[PDB]
Amino acid sequence: MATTTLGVKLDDPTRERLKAAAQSIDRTPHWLIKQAIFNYLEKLE
Amino acid sequence: MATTTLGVKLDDPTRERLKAAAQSIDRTPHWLIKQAIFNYLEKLE
Known part of the structure; x- marks a missing residue:
């Protein structure tokens, strides 16, 4: 997908x-970040 | 906040x-990304 890489603001914790x-x-952490950001749009969409 | 910078996977669109x-x-785009990721946790928390 058009995943452009921007610096995110996540904390280790x-x-x-x-x-x-x-x-x-049940997916990969980095890969989870994309859902957490895009899926977050689909959630409150 | 403990914002560690990781590469995100966002598309221009x-x-x-x-x-x-x-x-x-009513906040800043980069700064929005942190909410979209952390607030996303607080939402489905």
Whole structure:
């Protein structure tokens, strides 16, 4: 997908919590970040 | 905040849509990304 790489603002502590978000679908952390950002749009869309 | 900088996976088209998310609180795009990721945790928290 048109994934342009921008610097994100995540904290180690927070980054671990994202793993839980990845666990919801069972995907990779970096890859989870894309859902957490784009899926976040689809959620509140 | 402990904002560690990781490369994100955003698309220009998608990045513009984030601006709408920033418009919800009226904040800065980069800065919106942190909410879109952390607020996304607080939302589904």
